[PDB]
Amino acid sequence: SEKPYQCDFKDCERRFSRSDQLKRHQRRHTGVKPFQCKTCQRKFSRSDHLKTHTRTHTGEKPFSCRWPSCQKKFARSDELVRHHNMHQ
DNA sequence: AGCGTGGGCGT
DNA sequence: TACGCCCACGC
Ligand SMILES: [Zn+2]
Ligand SMILES: [Zn+2]
Ligand SMILES: [Zn+2]
């Protein structure tokens, strides 16, 4: 597809289809972290990454292993993916 | 293993 | 613009 939103930061060649995609990416350059955890006051560049971070404080693990007699659960989907891959 | 985080992707 | 899924990489 077409990607009209190009990043002009020094030595960056990243380009995107949407303007929010560019603005999100550019936070990696500036170090801006607009989202703060209300529990430990750590700051984050993104709201979705703040959300999964908060689960470290509560121990909430919404993603359970489907293998029989395996009670392993995880805070994020990608953790479960790696776990399921492990089970062969 | 647990999680920061960069990017794709949808709504 | 926001919101929050997924996937992968690299500690
Ligand atoms: Zn850039
Ligand atoms: Zn926190
Ligand atoms: Zn398992």
Side-chain angles (χ1 to χ4, degrees), chain A residues 2-5 7-70 72-88:
Chain A
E2 186 195 37
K3 299 173 181 176
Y5 296 94
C7 183
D8 294 322
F9 280 69
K10 180 171 183 176
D11 296 337
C12 190
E13 291 177 320
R14 294 283 194 259
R15 51 169 152 266
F16 306 92
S17 301
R18 297 154 41 178
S19 62
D20 51 327
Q21 300 172 330
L22 174 58
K23 291 186 178 181
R24 186 180 70 169
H25 156 75
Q26 287 172 337
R27 296 177 196 164
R28 89 168 289 184
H29 293 311
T30 58
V32 170
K33 300 179 180 182
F35 306 90
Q36 188 175 36
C37 179
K38 295 179 179 179
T39 301
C40 71
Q41 284 71 51
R42 181 169 183 168
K43 293 184 179 178
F44 300 86
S45 63
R46 291 158 51 168
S47 62
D48 53 351
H49 283 344
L50 167 60
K51 187 167 184 293
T52 54
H53 160 79
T54 59
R55 292 180 180 156
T56 65
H57 298 303
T58 60
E60 182 192 12
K61 301 181 179 182
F63 304 90
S64 302
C65 179
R66 299 170 180 268
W67 265 90
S69 72
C70 186
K72 300 296 185 181
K73 50 186 182 300
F74 307 93
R76 309 189 321 210
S77 60
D78 56 290
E79 295 179 83
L80 176 59
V81 165
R82 187 177 65 184
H83 181 76
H84 274 159
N85 288 338
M86 174 274 309
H87 277 288
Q88 305 303 325

